[PDB]
Ligand binder design. Structure first.
Ligand SMILES: Nc1nc2c(ncn2[C@@H]2O[C@H](COP(=O)(O)OP(=O)(O)NP(=O)(O)O)[C@@H](O)[C@H]2O)c(=O)[nH]1
Ligand SMILES: [Mg+2]
Length: 419
């Protein structure tokens, strides 16, 4: 059939990626119909890394945009919407300097507006937006919003949805369908998709993203130990304190200090447990830091750094992660490697290598102590980054919303036969 296109730039804290989506022009309202056509990863940091040089943020996008000009056929350029949405890197810069933030949005805007696409704006997503649009992505791709059954015999309970857990660079999101009463309006989400109501919980923990957790652990390690128990014995580095303390995430804790690893799983576990304040709950029950959260229920997909970390544990370390107990053993085993041990298991590039013990430990604690998974509910979590050929993230659901492609109700209401 005739095909339509749309483009999303996911301007995250640590990277920008460009996704081109495509769909049939006359069957564009079907769930699962939109899928990924192509993508491009911008080189270097995310747009917020250019706060002191905002025109470089715009120019960073140029190669991917040239690829978009080749990927979308010329005759459709002018009618292809293009959107940029930015996450916790831009949220954190907006705490630091609303002016620098606005100059970075202005530079990316000026670059984008001179391409021939229907450029529809650069915006900073709220934490709720980022969590919910990821849940829409996952569930749309896997066709969970289809009403299964036939007239006189609908499946009951209605088809379950898949919960979403996103471990980004600067924040982490959890979002799931719940039957529990809502006790905090900032967590409450009601969706009308294809004639049905989904009652959803969402929360974004700013500063609980992977790179921000590593910075807090580094600060905390320097304060309490003057060595890093999560780092492998024999690894060390020259740490620039200004970088540690400038983040809004750490500055609540002279120029260069040497820091070495000790391969101490038990002390690493204790350093990480300080990240989670479970000391009080103004609600009937909480995740952590006083945040309302109903009991986790149903299947979940854990993507982005959940996936990258688990893939290292399984593929590189050779260790199972099928139960929380296995995940915990995998983490101890990893944390107890010397730097020479660890490097010997990775023959290719070592960037990130010293950090897997800390991130795995954070992940095990986040799921068990923070979100209150147990062995029974954890069984229903899968680690994946792709569904039906499309990368899992908030970009697709953002696109679907802004291009108005998921209807609140089916046309003519399917003659009321779903009532
Ligand atoms: N181990 C590993 N980490 C990766 C890989 N690719 C990206 N990362 C890291 O994993 C974390 C998550 O990446 P990503 O989801 O792209 O983050 P983001 O969208 O830029 N951040 P945010 O959503 O918080 O604004 C970051 O700290 C990033 O650097 C990979 O292949 N392996
Ligand atoms: Mg992200």
């Amino acid at each position: 059939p005739a095909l339509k296109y749309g483009i999303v730039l996911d301007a995250g804290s640590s990277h920008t990626s460009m996704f081109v989506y495509k769909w049939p022009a006359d069957k564009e309202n079907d769930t699962g119909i939109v899928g990924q056509h192509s993508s491009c990863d911008v080189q270097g940091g995310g747009i917020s890394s250019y706060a002191n040089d905002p025109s470089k943020a715009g120019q960073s996008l140029v190669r991917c945009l040239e690829q978009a000009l080749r990927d979308v056929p010329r005759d459709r350029h002018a009618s292809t919407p293009l959107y940029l949405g930015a996450t916790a890197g831009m949220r954190l810069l907006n705490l630091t300097s609303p002016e620098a933030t606005a100059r970075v949005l202005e530079a990316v805007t000026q670059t984008l507006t001179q391409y021939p696409f229907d450029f529809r704006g650069a915006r900073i997503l709220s934490g709720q937006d980022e969590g919910v649009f990821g849940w829409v992505t996952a569930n749309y791709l896997l066709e969970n919003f289809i009403k299964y059954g036939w007239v006189g015999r609908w499946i009951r309970p209605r088809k379950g949805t898949l919960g979403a857990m996103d471990l980004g660079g600067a924040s982490t999101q959890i979002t799931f369908e719940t039957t529990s009463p809502s006790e905090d309006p900032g967590n409450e989400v009601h969706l009308r998709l294809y004639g049905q109501h989904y009652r959803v919980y969402t929360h974004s923990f700013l500063c609980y993203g992977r790179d921000q957790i590593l910075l807090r652990l580094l600060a905390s390690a320097l304060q309490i130990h003057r060595f890093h128990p999560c780092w492998p014995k024999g690894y060390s580095t020259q740490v620039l304190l200004q970088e540690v303390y400038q983040s809004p995430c750490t500055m609540g804790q002279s120029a260069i200090v040497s820091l070495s690893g000790t391969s101490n799983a038990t002390l690493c576990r204790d350093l990480v447990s300080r990240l989670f304040n479970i000391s009080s709950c103004p609600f009937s029950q909480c995740s952590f830091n006083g945040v309302f959260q109903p009991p986790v229920a149903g299947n979940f997909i854990a993507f982005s750094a959940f996936y990258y970390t688990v893939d290292f544990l399984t593929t590189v370390m050779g260790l199972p992660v099928g139960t929380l107990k296995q995940l915990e053993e995998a983490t101890e085993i990893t944390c107890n490697q010397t730097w020479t041990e660890l490097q010997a298991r990775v023959p290719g590039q070592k960037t990130r290598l010293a950090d897997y013990c800390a991130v795995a430990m954070f992940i095990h604690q986040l799921l068990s102590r923070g979100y209150h998974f147990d062995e029974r509910s954890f069984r229903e979590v899968v680690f994946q980054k792709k569904a039906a050929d499309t990368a899992v993230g908030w970009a697709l659901g953002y696109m679907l919303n802004l291009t108005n492609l998921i209807p609140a109700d089916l046309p003519g209401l399917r003659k009321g036969t779903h009532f």
